[PDB]
Ligand SMILES: NC(=O)c1ccc[n+]([C@@H]2O[C@H](COP(=O)([O-])OP(=O)(O)OC[C@H]3O[C@@H](n4cnc5c(N)ncnc54)[C@H](OP(=O)(O)O)[C@@H]3O)[C@@H](O)[C@H]2O)c1
């Protein structure tokens with residue numbers, strides 16, 4: 239097991255064990271992200287690298303790692319890596335798609351429902367004792383929320399996660415609108431999803447769910463202008479990336495009644511704190527837990543081991559991101 | 572509009588307006604439940620009565636209401652009314668089924684996902700600034716929750732709400748088990764739901780959802796013995812009636828790890844406070860808001876008016892509960 243690999247955070251043990259007999263494994267042990275200073279130092283003799291979304295694996299990193307031929311991100315997204323600079327150095331970059339799809343769609347719907355029906359607020363009300371204090375049991379007009387069944391959901395990014403979200407929406411007999419770079423008719427057919435230019439999707443939707451990678455294009459896709467297109471009753475759900483939304487524009491819309499509420503799993507800076515946003519009652523927040531299900535994180539761990547182990551054996555990584563590097567160099571150490 | 576009617580709480584105005592031109596409408600205006608003292612006094616000259624879940628419409632009430640010939644409950648459940656004593660006195664009792672089905676199923680699934688994925692907890696963590704304070708952005712083992720998609724759900728009471736919940740479960744490709752008093756083949760066929768004696772449903776389900784009315788039989792159906800039957804990974808969802816569950820047994824199961832967590836919308840006493848339960852992080856609570864969607868509450872108001880207006884025109888109420896009273900006396904004032 240000559241191949242050296244450094245994992246920047248403690249992923250589920252199943253992945254670690256899978257790599258044991260094939261690699262010399264070292265793993266960062268503190269919960270907080272690893273300081274760059276230390277990282278630059280630990281990547282000197284490594285062949286493989288397993289990083290997290292929060293870590294920025296740019297050019298400076300690839301420089302201090304002369305022997306690094308593969309970087310397996312422990313996420314499906316990969317906007318934290320400079321994939322262009324890596325394809326140049328013949329460095330393979332993998333990710334973990336599909337294994338975390340259901341957990342992320344499951345969380346998107348939890349947010350949609352929690353926001354639409356005020357579960358967080360109602361919980362605080364009960365748990366704090368306030369409900370008991372008030373002496374009121376049940377009231378016709380208390381915590382009135384929005385209907386979900388039969389409503390129109392507009393998925394922005396009908397990819398692996400987007401499609402999973404649409405499959406669930408069918409269970410809520412929703413009318414499914416979606417905006418995406420292309421139209422895959424076999425997908426439109428199976429899900430009964432209808433393409434709509436972004437402006438139309440924003441105008442006709444009761445729930446708008448973001449599920450696109452973060453790129454130059456998607457950066458601030460949801461701005462103060464597009465926020466005005468949505469209905470005053472619509473709710474926005476973001477389980478994509480924090481920067482796909484203009485927080486300031488969003489905070490304005492919520493305070494100004496442009497839309498009804500928001501469920502946010504991601505933010506422009508993580509961790510995040512914003513007194514204004516957090517004062518709001520029509521907002522539900524979670525600390526980037528989209529893929530946090532026992533099953534998903536375990537599957538991610540196993541998929542990363544598969545990619546690194548296939549690369550060892552001179553094979554194209556099952557979930558290789560930049561296939562254009564197959565040319566610059568072939569699989570191996 | 573000779574007929575007099577007294578609504579015990581301010582239901583959506585659309586219902587009041589519908590009755591305004593056919594009845595002499597009076598409505599209790601405080602938000603807290605009307606004191607019995609005042610109530611007994613207000614029902615003296617009333618022909619119709621519109622009550623809430625919170626009010627106990629027993630014999631003592633039917634007495635002080637010599638003209639009262641119809642009590643429209645503003646709820647689908649009716650365990651708050653002494654239906655027996657009413658059918659005796661020739662008093663028609665109606666409820667509001669179907670109009671609130673979707674809102675309750677929607678809330679039931681919202682609790683399911685929020686408990687499974689720690690939504691409430693995650694929000695407190697983010698909102699309180701604690702997440703920012705700790706310095707960790709994203710961690711492989713943080714807030715790990717349970718998968719929903721593909722899992723097994725056991726619906727106890729496959730009625731109007733139960734079936735709605737099963738329709739949504741299909742959206743999560745769940746395997747649907749269900750315990751109920753009878754088996755309706757056409758329903759099993761449409762939902763792909765499989766009957767299972769209560770005991771098997773409890774051992775095989777990852778999510779147990781209660782949707783039965785409160786009765787002698789269902790009283791404390793979920794006790795310390797049946798809770799031991801559930802998986803240590805299972806989650807219990809109660810959107811039925813607080814007393815269908817033995818809170819004490821539940822609190823025990825939760826602290827002891829007999830089951831993973833609970834999502835509760837109803838309680839044995841409302842409003843409710845319980846320091847032990849509320850200290851728990853694997854419990855999600857909401858103040859009996861199951862039917863609190865704009866559409867549901869509005870449809871309930873309109874349905875109650877349709878019932879009262881049909882009874883006036885000498886017709887059998889569309890959603891008449893106690894049909895055995897059709898004999899004791901015909902429809903009218
Ligand atoms: N919150 C969490 O815990 C969590 C968990 C997992 C993933 N995520 C986020 O979810 C993202 C997507 O995940 P996925 O697996 O579903 O990836 P994916 O399938 O590759 O992407 C989904 C869709 O985004 C579309 N898209 C890309 N750029 C677009 C643009 N400019 N305009 C419109 N549509 C665009 C893609 O269309 P085409 O492919 O046809 O161009 C694709 O249909 C990840 O990249 C990550 O940022 C968050």
Ligand SMILES: NC(=O)c1ccc[n+]([C@@H]2O[C@H](COP(=O)([O-])OP(=O)(O)OC[C@H]3O[C@@H](n4cnc5c(N)ncnc54)[C@H](OP(=O)(O)O)[C@@H]3O)[C@@H](O)[C@H]2O)c1
Nearest residue numbers: 648728729730731732751752753783784788810811861862
């Ligand atoms: N939390 C909220 O905000 C909220 C909102 C609305 C309603 N609710 C509660 O939900 C209850 C059910 O609503 P629904 O419209 O679905 O009523 P439903 O359709 O009349 O009843 C649902 C099911 O319960 C079954 N059942 C009754 N007794 C049982 C027993 N002893 N063992 C097993 N199954 C039994 C019934 O079977 P059978 O057909 O064989 O009798 C039926 O299949 C309401 O009565 C109310 O208590 C709560």
